[PDB]
Amino acid sequence: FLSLDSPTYVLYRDRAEWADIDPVPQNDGPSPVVQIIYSEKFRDVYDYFRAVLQRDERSERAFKLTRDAIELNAANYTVWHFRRVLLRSLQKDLQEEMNYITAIIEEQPKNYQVWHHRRVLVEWLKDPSQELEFIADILNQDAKNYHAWQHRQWVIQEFRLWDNELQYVDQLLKEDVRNNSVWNQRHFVISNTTGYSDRAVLEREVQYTLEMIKLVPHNESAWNYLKGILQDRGLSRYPNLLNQLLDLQPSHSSPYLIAFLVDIYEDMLENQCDNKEDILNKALELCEILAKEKDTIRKEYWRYIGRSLQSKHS
Amino acid sequence: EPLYSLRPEHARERLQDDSVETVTSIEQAKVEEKIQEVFSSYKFNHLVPRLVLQREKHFHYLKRGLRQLTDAYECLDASRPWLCYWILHSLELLDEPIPQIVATDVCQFLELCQSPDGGFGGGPGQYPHLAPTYAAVNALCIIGTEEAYNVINREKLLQYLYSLKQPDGSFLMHVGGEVDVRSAYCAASVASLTNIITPDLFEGTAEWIARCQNWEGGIGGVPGMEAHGGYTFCGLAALVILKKERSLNLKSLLQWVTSRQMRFEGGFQGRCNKLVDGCYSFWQAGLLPLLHRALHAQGDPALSMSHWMFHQQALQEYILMCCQCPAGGLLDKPGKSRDFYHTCYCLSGLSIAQHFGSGAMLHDVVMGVPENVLQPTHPVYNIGPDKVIQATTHFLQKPVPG
Ligand SMILES: Cn1cncc1[C@@](O)(c1ccc(Cl)cc1)c1cc2cc(C(=O)NN3CCOCC3)cc(-c3ccccc3)c2o1
Ligand SMILES: CC(C)=CCC/C(C)=C/CC/C(C)=C/COP(=O)(O)OP(=O)(O)O
Numbered sequence A: 001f002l003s004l005d006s007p008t009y010v011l012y013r014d015r016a017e018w019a020d021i022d023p024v025p026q027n028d029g030p031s032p033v034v035q036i037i038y039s040e041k042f043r044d045v046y047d048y049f050r051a052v053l054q055r056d057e058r059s060e061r062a063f064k065l066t067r068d069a070i071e072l073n074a075a076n077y078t079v080w081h082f083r084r085v086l087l088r089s090l091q092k093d094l095q096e097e098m099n100y101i102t103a104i105i106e107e108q109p110k111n112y113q114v115w116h117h118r119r120v121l122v123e124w125l126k127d128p129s130q131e132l133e134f135i136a137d138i139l140n141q142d143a144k145n146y147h148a149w150q151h152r153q154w155v156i157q158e159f160r161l162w163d164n165e166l167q168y169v170d171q172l173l174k175e176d177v178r179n180n181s182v183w184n185q186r187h188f189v190i191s192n193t194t195g196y197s198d199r200a201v202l203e204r205e206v207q208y209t210l211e212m213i214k215l216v217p218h219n220e221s222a223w224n225y226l227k228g229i230l231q232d233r234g235l236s237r238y239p240n241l242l243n244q245l246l247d248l249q250p251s252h253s254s255p256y257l258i259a260f261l262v263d264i265y266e267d268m269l270e271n272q273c274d275n276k277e278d279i280l281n282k283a284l285e286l287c288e289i290l291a292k293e294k295d296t297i298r299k300e301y302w303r304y305i306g307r308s309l310q311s312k313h314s
Numbered sequence B: 001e002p003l004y005s006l007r008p009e010h011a012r013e014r015l016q017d018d019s020v021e022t023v024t025s026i027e028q029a030k031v032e033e034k035i036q037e038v039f040s041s042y043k044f045n046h047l048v049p050r051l052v053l054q055r056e057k058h059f060h061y062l063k064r065g066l067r068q069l070t071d072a073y074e075c076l077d078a079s080r081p082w083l084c085y086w087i088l089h090s091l092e093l094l095d096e097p098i099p100q101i102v103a104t105d106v107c108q109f110l111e112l113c114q115s116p117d118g119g120f121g122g123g124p125g126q127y128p129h130l131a132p133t134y135a136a137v138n139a140l141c142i143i144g145t146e147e148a149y150n151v152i153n154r155e156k157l158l159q160y161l162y163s164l165k166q167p168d169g170s171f172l173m174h175v176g177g178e179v180d181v182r183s184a185y186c187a188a189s190v191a192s193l194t195n196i197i198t199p200d201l202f203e204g205t206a207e208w209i210a211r212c213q214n215w216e217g218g219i220g221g222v223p224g225m226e227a228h229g230g231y232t233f234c235g236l237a238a239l240v241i242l243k244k245e246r247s248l249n250l251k252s253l254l255q256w257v258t259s260r261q262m263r264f265e266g267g268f269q270g271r272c273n274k275l276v277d278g279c280y281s282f283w284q285a286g287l288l289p290l291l292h293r294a295l296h297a298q299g300d301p302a303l304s305m306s307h308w309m310f311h312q313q314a315l316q317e318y319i320l321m322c323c324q325c326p327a328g329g330l331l332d333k334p335g336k337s338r339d340f341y342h343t344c345y346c347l348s349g350l351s352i353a354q355h356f357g358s359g360a361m362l363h364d365v366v367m368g369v370p371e372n373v374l375q376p377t378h379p380v381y382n383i384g385p386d387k388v389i390q391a392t393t394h395f396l397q398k399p400v401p402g
């Protein structure tokens, strides 16, 4: 292996062990469009990749070449496909390839190809033993990397590794209670384990969320989670909720609290509530305050809500 | 004053971290301080603010990129049809004609990009992939000539789509590749425009997409994942193409997207508790015209007759004051480097925000100088509405392959 960054790196056209092969230049046609003026290093590696792809040469040197083509452009999915062909055809040790993908993902975590490649290797080896820990290290650098969370969900689901994830969720929530990815992971773990029907679980969750809301009134994630686990069976199914939210309104107020209250008024006005002319006006006044003072960025949305609430509850 | 984000009341929209700091709040505060500087720059320099879309500067940027790019674009060597689409759409939005010689050149380049298997690759000889296939088809349609339409091998395209179809209703992005809601949209987009939709091609797709909607109201890449504007756009748009928008809880979705607009910045974020980004001016805001059309089809009587359900003015102020690179091209947020992807979507979003349309009604809101008005864009395909109708009618002149 001769690193693409090594001081003694040599273009492939100047390499003896490649003299037999004629590189294949890229054909962009007579009048190119969106033509990229590649560096000599790039064009050199890819002219030989094209040669090895055309001739479908499944050799150790071709395998080493894909590594350089990948490094020059990790987004080239065609190269990644040929590399997987070589892995099978050459019978390459897959853990060695696992160490390789571990390194490249650390380098470029926001790439679709690198994660899919890791998935294929895990699928091939039927071995998720390193996954949770590896993903955890990536998440320790970017706690919100979409691919990382997606890969974590896939591993946990396929190999049934649920036992310790909620603990992990609590760990990251303590580090940043505003991490929407962690709240999503929380709902992921719970809905695929115990579910939200067990009253002991639903209550536990609502209390935790309300408590987090008390700690950080303006954290939209806790509010969205609370709404998400209750709008299922309908907010009006829980009477104590309304007053309990109105209780922390003098101090822990936020445009989120106002909005939630409105979400309760509309469910009530939809499930035959008492004074269905008294609750309606409470809501319209809130839609008013929201659209006019407390949350004007969404004035068009709130004005729509008011008009829709009258359109069927007048 | 005339500008929403410069008014004194707006200062109240700054982030309140409740005295509990975390990576999220700190990072959201950094961007807000940076955006405020831009907003206050006019008062600071003692000048009257004027919002001008640097049409000329962006044009040069685009016109040049369409032909040649530096080695800085090596990372997009597997995304060239994308470059063709982003640039041509930008020029289209800026209402700049495409020389017949350039059009034919684009057509010939995408021909080389087309695979013998069907679909298009990210460049000559590259395996077909659904993202560049969507890009190629959209570009060819923007051109809209008989030549461009004929580049597409409809029979092979269908075959390719079928090779990616999974039993659960989803599609692979490419052979031996990954799956997420993007593939559903790319497949539905190209299959509908070219009229190759067979009775069973999208069987189960609508259901698989509906499974991607989560507790947040938005849509994730795959079932179980966090709600994200890019994926939510793909999901809904795909459903509108398949006529199954109904499969979604549209009310929870509407509430989620509207909450994605930043009260202070004016632009949108891609997901809850993350940073604002100019490209989401299309991915997120573009969902309002889709929901407006979906709700109206259900006979929703509360829908406005002149505005989309998001602050059109604020999104325009964000884009115009914070997303233009003085050298030409648009971007994520101030401090970031320009690129054609962000140029394409920042302009697409500006278009959405200044053009309302619901049947017989038409209402515009063009912030800043009048010359800022752009050509309208179709909310499903993100190409001109005329190009959609033109391409659609054209391919309807031929039967669905067998
Ligand atoms: C999440 N996000 C929010 N804002 C941007 C992103 C992005 O991370 C993203 C990830 C995945 C998806 Cl599906 C969509 C967007 C992203 C960044 C980016 C830059 C360029 C780009 O042109 N960068 N230039 C290259 C030349 O040097 C200047 C920067 C091109 C693309 C690109 C987009 C679609 C297809 C092919 C390519 C980019 O994509
Ligand atoms: C048609 C088509 C291809 C549509 C898809 C568009 C799109 C923008 C998809 C988002 C994919 C993604 C991995 C986002 C996370 O990036 P991030 O965390 O860096 O960005 P964020 O912080 O803004 O969420």
Ligand SMILES: [Zn+2]
Pocket (backbone or CB within 6 Å): B277, B278, B279, B280, B332, B342
């Ligand atoms: Zn962006």
